[PDB]
């Protein structure tokens, strides 16, 4: 892997950093060469065609919000994509992300959450309100419908995830919600542990595909509280309720 990332100047890193901290999210498409983005879209399609699994559940640890989408789990992506695992460890990608985040990124200590592909396809599909166990995700928007079909990201930064008492609606009541429209081929960088977020349910059948690479910050390397809520890797986790 040779020319993954465009070079960002000092003032570009300042502007991206500022937005990333203020909003919990910033668009980083300009950082990744179009060919690389085209290669990832092709890889995700190949992975989905072989391994897509359906999820339809509500998650107890996020106030029973919905997860309705197909997925490709992390160990399956890792075992079958040298492109994705190479990019995940690529200095030319991690260096500027560390500059934007203002801290060092580490491989996710949980093998089941390095990577995730999701595909929303049905009217009503959604990635319901939630936070991440880890600090960082790079989200590759490989395919997104037009703005009026839905699938927009909503964020509330500067919050946190209390699995025993999530109080997601209180966080909405107490903070403005920011809404983002991403197009096919966009990439964004998200502070997932402190940014409450979701995708707006699709208004009609269509296709929305992202790839998620998740990294740990130093704060993530210490022991975490165990919860049986890791639904993307196993729908039968005890925190998950199947949908009526
Ligand atoms: N915590 C997320 C899952 C992230 C999996 C990929 N890092 C959720 O509840 O939907
Ligand atoms: O679908 C998206 O744009 C973001 C998905 C998300 O929240 C995640 O992958 O953890
Ligand atoms: Cl997340
Ligand atoms: Fe997320």
Bridge partner residues of 156 (DSSP): 196
* Residue of 200, 210, 199 lying closest to 141 (CA atoms): 210
What tokens does 233 get? Answer: 């890797």
Give, for ligand 2, the residue of 190, 195, 196 to mutate: max count of ligand atoms closer than 8 Å to Cβ.
Answer: 190
Q: Is 162 exposed, middle or buried (0-12, 13-18, 19+ CB in 10 A)?
A: exposed
DSSP letter (8 states) at residue 149? G
* Residue of 1, 72, 65, 70 lying closest to 32 (CA atoms): 1
- 3-state helix, strand, coil split of the chain in percent (to 5) is 30, 30, 40
* Residue of 219, 234, 189 lying closest to 109 (CA atoms): 219
CB 214 within 8 A of CB 114: yes
- Indicate the resolution in Å: 2.0
Atom of ligand 1 nearest to the CA of 108: 7
Alpha-carbon torsion (81, 125, 29, 20), positive or negative? negative
Q: What's the residue count for the chain? A: 244
Number of structural domains in the chain: 1
Phi, psi (5° rounding) for residue 231?
-65, -30
What tokens does 187 get? Answer: 């990439």
Residue list, CB under 5 A from ion ligand 3:
132, 192
What tokens does 52 get? Answer: 């897509």
**CA-angle at 116, arms to 139 and 243, nearest 5°:** 110
C-alpha torsion 184→156→159→230, nearest 10: -40
Give, for ligand 2, the residue of 127, 145, 207 to mutate: max count of ligand atoms closer than 8 Å to Cβ.
Answer: 127
Q: Where in the sequence is the domain holding 29, given as residue range(s)?
A: 1-244
CA–CA distance, 208 with 12 (Å, rounded to integer):
29
C-alpha torsion 37→186→204→195, nearest 10: 120
Phi, psi (5° rounding) for residue 181?
-110, 115
């Amino acid at each position: 892997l040779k020319d993954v990332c465009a070079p960002l100047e000092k003032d570009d890193i300042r502007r991206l950093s500022q937005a990333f901290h203020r909003f919990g999210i910033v668009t980083v498409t300009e950082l990744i060469e179009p060919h690389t983005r085209k290669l990832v879209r092709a890889e995700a399609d190949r992975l989905l065609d072989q391994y897509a699994e359906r999820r339809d559940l509500r998650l107890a640890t996020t106030d029973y919000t919905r997860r309705s989408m197909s997925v490709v789990p992390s160990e399956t992506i890792a075992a079958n994509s040298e492109l994705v695992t190479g990019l995940y460890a690529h200095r030319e990608l991690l260096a500027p992300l560390e500059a934007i985040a203002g801290e060092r990124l580490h491989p996710c200590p949980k093998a089941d959450e390095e990577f995730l592909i999701t595909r929303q396809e049905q009217r009503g599909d959604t990635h319901g309100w939630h936070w991440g166990d880890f600090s960082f995700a790079l989200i590759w928007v490989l395919q997104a419908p037009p703005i009026d079909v839905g699938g927009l990201l909503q964020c509330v930064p500067h919050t946190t995830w209390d699995k025993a008492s999530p109080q997601i609606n209180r966080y909405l009541v107490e903070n403005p919600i920011d809404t983002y429209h991403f197009e096919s081929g966009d990439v964004y960088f998200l502070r997932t542990d402190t940014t409450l977020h979701r995708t707006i349910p699709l208004r009609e059948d269509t296709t929305r595909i992202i790839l998620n690479m998740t990294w740990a910050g130093e704060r993530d390397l210490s022991r975490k509280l165990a919860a049986d809520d890791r639904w993307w890797d196993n729908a039968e986790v005890s925190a998950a309720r199947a949908i009526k």
